[PDB]
Amino acid sequence: DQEFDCERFRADIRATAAAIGAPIAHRLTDTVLEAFRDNFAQGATLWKTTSQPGDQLSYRFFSRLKMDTVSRAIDAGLLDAAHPTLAVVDAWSSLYGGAPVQSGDFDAGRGMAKTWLYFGGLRPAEDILTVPALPASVQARLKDFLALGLAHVRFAAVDWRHHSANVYFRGKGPLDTVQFARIHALSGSTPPAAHVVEEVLAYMPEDYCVAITLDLHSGDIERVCFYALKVPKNALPRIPTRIARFLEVAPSHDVEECNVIGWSFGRSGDYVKAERSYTGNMAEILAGWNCFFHGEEGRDHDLRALH
């Protein structure tokens, strides 16, 4: 059934990872799951991977239970207390007097991966990109984003291994060749062929969300990624077979089935991301954040009203 059962999820990870050829740390997971049973239990658990061969199986909860997932992570020993990105997660978490809420991304065979932050609103790039905790080099980048017209952040994702953060913007679209070209420009990636850009654009909500990855010491834009939400299996774009596999193999028990696809472009190689819901009503949490689903509205009224 559609309920969350910890013994079965344990099995589902091991199974899916084995399925897609990604490594597994049995102890480590048993701990991830012990530490955050309740969060997984009460939110929307979901799967992700990339088309990178033999890439990790990541699993994630999007909270409904608000709590300090970081202190927790440190407690269970999944995360080092002396980690030098902590002070940013705290900066960000502490905005709007504790309004934001933490979620957890983990890996089949590496453990804790990222901490996610939903800020509550369509917050100013400024608020996010200028907290004291971020070096000069990183703050320095707001002007580039504002310049591309990327005023508003909705989430931000501290990546714990690579001491870098993913910033989720929303653009006043629709997304043209040139606005795409300009954003891709930031990755330093080689420009792609016309249709690669056409395909992505085809899948875009009029008002589109784009994730930019900054190195939290250097402030460089390692890579960028464009997202298409709750795309049905029948109406997917041309995908790599690993991702094909992943969508076939990874179990979903949501009443409303929900796949996400993302084209990450980056100077060390372009890949395709995929998310897929397990338990928890992913779609329901996502509509509740005012995301937008493939072939629906697309249009942001709160956003154009500040433009």
What does the DSSP assignment read for 32-80? Answer: HHHHTHHHHHHSEEEEEEESSTTPPPEEEEE-SS-S-HHHHHHHTTSS-
Task: Quickly tell me which residue has 């990327």 as its tokens.
Answer: 150
CB 209 within 8 A of CB 152: no
With a CB cutoff of 8 Å and minimum separation 6, the contacts of 62 are 43, 44, 46, 103, 116, 118, 280, 282, 285
CA distance 183 to 117: 23
Q: Which amino acid is located at 20 in the chain?
A: I
Tokens matching residue 62: 């999007």
What are the Cα distances from residue 120, in Å, to 16, 56, 92, 115, 249?
32, 29, 12, 16, 33
Query: Dihedral of the CA atoms 232, 233, 238, 241 (nearest 10)?
Result: 140
Helices 6-20 & 241-249, crossing angle to 10 degrees? 160
CB 35 within 8 A of CB 78: yes
Helices 194-202 & 177-184, crossing angle to 10 degrees? 110
Element (H, E) at 152: strand 152-159
Query: Dihedral of the CA atoms 171, 187, 117, 77 (nearest 10)?
Result: 170
Asked whether residue 154 is marked as a ligand-binding residue, the answer is yes
Q: What's the Rg (C-alpha) of the chain?
A: 18
Domain hosting 219: range is 1-307
CA distance 255 to 119: 27
Q: What is the DSSP secondary structure assignment for residue 171, as one 8-state letter?
A: -
Cα 76-79-82 angle, rounded to 5 deg:
120
- Total residue count of the chain as it appears in this document: 307
SS3 state of residue 121: strand
Method of determination is X-ray
Helices 6-20 & 26-35, crossing angle to 10 degrees? 140
CB 61 within 8 A of CB 278: no
Q: Which amino acid is located at 27 in the chain?
A: R
CA distance 13 to 29: 9
Asked whether residue 299 is marked as a ligand-binding residue, the answer is no
- Tally of domains within the chain: 1
CB 210 within 8 A of CB 226: yes
Tokens matching residue 129: 């990109």
